[PDB]
């Protein structure tokens, strides 16, 4: 398969290096940003139901899956949001993260803290808190199915998804470090769900295993 490899913009690369070399024990943070954009992505795509209906003839149903799976180590986050385009994943992610994380670093050193990355709609790369490898497969009605990657380190690879179609919206698969399996236990999550997700306004089903 032709897999294609970027190097992240200088920004993104730094905020990346800072989220995975600072000491910060408040990990379970990341949940909350990938399910608020899971969230932002219904909210996106209910948006354009109105305005167009067919828009909807890849999936009806608007909800939010959280799946662990203790033999591959992994978590994934699934929406049936609006999903990203191939420009979306290189081009379009680049540039909002490149003015976010300038906003956010100057921010760090005026009082804030790293639980506050959303604010700066950079909340997504709290999952290197976490994982050592983030695969994000995406679908988009306008587009194709691609699989974005990254283990940091500077690049991340796209490739046209020749697996499982989804119709519509984005999976984050969490490949969680050997220390952070605390993640895929049931109380756990639902733990996290109750205290920082407790009034999102699409149905969030816990898998079971
Ligand atoms: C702002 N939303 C609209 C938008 C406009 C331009 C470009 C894309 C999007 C878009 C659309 C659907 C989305 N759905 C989910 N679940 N998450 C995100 C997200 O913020 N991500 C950050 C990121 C970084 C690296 C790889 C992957 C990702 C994913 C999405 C982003």
């Given at each position: 398969?032709?897999?294609?490899?970027?190097?992240?913009?200088?920004?993104?690369?730094?905020?990346?290096?800072?989220?995975?070399?600072?000491?910060?024990?408040?990990?379970?943070?990341?949940?909350?940003?990938?399910?608020?954009?899971?969230?932002?992505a219904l909210?996106?795509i209910?948006?354009?139901?109105?305005?167009?209906?067919?828009?909807?003839?890849?999936?009806?149903?608007?909800?939010?899956?959280?799946?662990?799976?203790?033999?591959?180590?992994?978590?994934?986050?699934?929406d049936?949001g609006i999903?990203?385009?191939?420009?979306?994943?290189?081009?379009?992610?680049?540039?909002?993260?490149?003015?976010?994380?300038?906003?956010?670093?100057?921010?760090?050193?005026?009082?804030?803290?790293?639980?506050?990355?959303?604010?700066?709609?950079?909340?997504?790369?709290?999952?290197?808190?976490?994982?050592?490898?983030?695969?994000?497969?995406?679908?988009?009605?306008?587009?194709?199915?691609?699989?974005?990657?990254?283990?940091?380190?500077?690049?991340?690879?796209?490739?046209?998804?020749?697996?499982?179609?989804?119709?519509?919206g984005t999976?984050?698969?969490?490949?969680?470090?050997?220390?952070?399996?605390?993640?895929?236990?049931?109380?756990?999550?639902?733990?996290?769900?109750?205290?920082?997700?407790?009034?999102?306004?699409?149905?969030?089903?816990?898998?079971?295993?």
């Amino acid at each position: 398969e032709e897999v294609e490899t970027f190097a992240f913009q200088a920004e993104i690369a730094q905020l990346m290096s800072l989220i995975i070399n600072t000491f910060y024990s408040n990990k379970e943070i990341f949940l909350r940003e990938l399910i608020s954009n899971s969230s932002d992505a219904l909210d996106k795509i209910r948006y354009e139901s109105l305005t167009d209906p067919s828009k909807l003839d890849s999936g009806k149903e608007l909800h939010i899956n959280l799946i662990p799976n203790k033999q591959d180590r992994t978590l994934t986050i699934v929406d049936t949001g609006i999903g990203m385009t191939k420009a979306d994943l290189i081009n379009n992610l680049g540039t909002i993260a490149k003015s976010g994380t300038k906003a956010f670093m100057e921010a760090l050193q005026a009082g804030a803290d790293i639980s506050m990355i959303g604010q700066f709609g950079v909340g997504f790369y709290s999952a290197y808190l976490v994982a050592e490898k983030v695969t994000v497969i995406t679908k988009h009605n306008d587009d194709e199915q691609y699989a974005w990657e990254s283990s940091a380190g500077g690049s991340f690879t796209v490739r046209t998804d020749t697996g499982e179609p989804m119709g519509r919206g984005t999976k984050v698969i969490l490949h969680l470090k050997e220390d952070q399996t605390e993640y895929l236990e049931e109380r756990r999550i639902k733990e996290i769900v109750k205290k920082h997700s407790q009034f999102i306004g699409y149905p969030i089903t816990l898998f079971v295993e």
